[PDB]
Swiss-Prot record, chain A:
The gene is FAS2. This is Fatty acid synthase subunit alpha. [Alpha(6)beta(6)] hexamers of two multifunctional subunits (alpha and beta). Belongs to the thiolase-like superfamily. Fungal fatty acid synthetase subunit alpha family. Fatty acid synthetase catalyzes the formation of long-chain fatty acids from acetyl-CoA, malonyl-CoA and NADPH. The alpha subunit contains domains for: acyl carrier protein, 3-oxoacyl-[acyl-carrier-protein] reductase, and 3-oxoacyl-[acyl-carrier-protein] synthase. The chain holds residues 630 to 677 of 1885 of the full protein.
From Swiss-Prot, chain B:
Belongs to the fungal fatty acid synthetase subunit beta family. This is Fatty acid synthase subunit beta. The chain holds residues 1359 to 1528 of 2037 of the full protein. It comes from Candida albicans (Yeast). [Alpha(6)beta(6)] hexamers of two multifunctional subunits (alpha and beta). It comes from the Eukaryota. Fatty acid synthetase catalyzes the formation of long-chain fatty acids from acetyl-CoA, malonyl-CoA and NADPH. The beta subunit contains domains for: [acyl-carrier-protein] acetyltransferase and malonyltransferase, S-acyl fatty acid synthase thioesterase, enoyl-[acyl-carrier-protein] reductase, and 3-hydroxypalmitoyl-[acyl-carrier-protein] dehydratase.
Amino acid sequence: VSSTIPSQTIPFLHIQKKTKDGWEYNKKLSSLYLDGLESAAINGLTFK
Amino acid sequence: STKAEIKAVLNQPSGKLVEVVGTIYREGKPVMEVTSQFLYRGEYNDYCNTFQKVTETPVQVAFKSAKDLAVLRSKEWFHLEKDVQFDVLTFRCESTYKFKSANVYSSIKTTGQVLLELPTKEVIQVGSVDYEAGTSYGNPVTDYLSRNGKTIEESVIFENAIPLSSGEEL
Amino acid sequence: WTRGTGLMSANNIIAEGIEKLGVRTFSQKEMAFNILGLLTPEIVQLCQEEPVMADLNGGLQFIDNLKDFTSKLRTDLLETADIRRAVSIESAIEQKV
């Protein structure tokens, strides 16, 4: 997904990071979430 | 002068109900309506020679919404002959029945007229409607106008009765 | 915006409307998937270092006056559906007459 997220476009499901102005969309952190979501879709989630 | 015109010839279980509403003219301008009913007591089955051309009253429907336009459009008999928003009717209509049996009508003919309020209480001319049918148990137009509400009724009945000139001096 | 059975079955009828702005609504399985994606080993390790806001809202934050937008969408749907039901009811009455 890192190569899939369009430029200047905020994905629907995004992890926010807190800076001085407040919580804002952070691209690398949201991409880390979305790649885990790929791993959960193609392979799944481990919960043991 | 005089002017007679047959309106209805009904076949009820009491017999033919001749309906004559011959009006009266004093040089052109109508003066009196004068409706009379005669009844050929007996039992008659001739239904081809049976009809009832009733004229309707200024019947007012009851509505308050914008669905009113949609309902009026849905009526295939109504034809658009005005350019003002719809919320209520006061049609002065008139129809023509043809009986093929005791209650069922061989055909229906309705032409009527259309009514609704105009700008600043300054009303001018209006348009009309049209309808035909066949082998029907009722008239859609009149029943619709009535079902939404009663006509222009300048008659609301008083609550309780008291005497006026009751006694033996009447 | 989550679409489920229960007491929110009355707000599902506008979900299609909002979704055609470029926002997306979620079913209950989709929000299960999204929140279970917060339990991945990387997000879990990322929570031991930093508290994590996960905006799983599907873009509903970009709609100005969401309350009024949803209210007028619902009003439009209701005022279409009721008049459609009523025209049909009146036509059925006419046909029975």
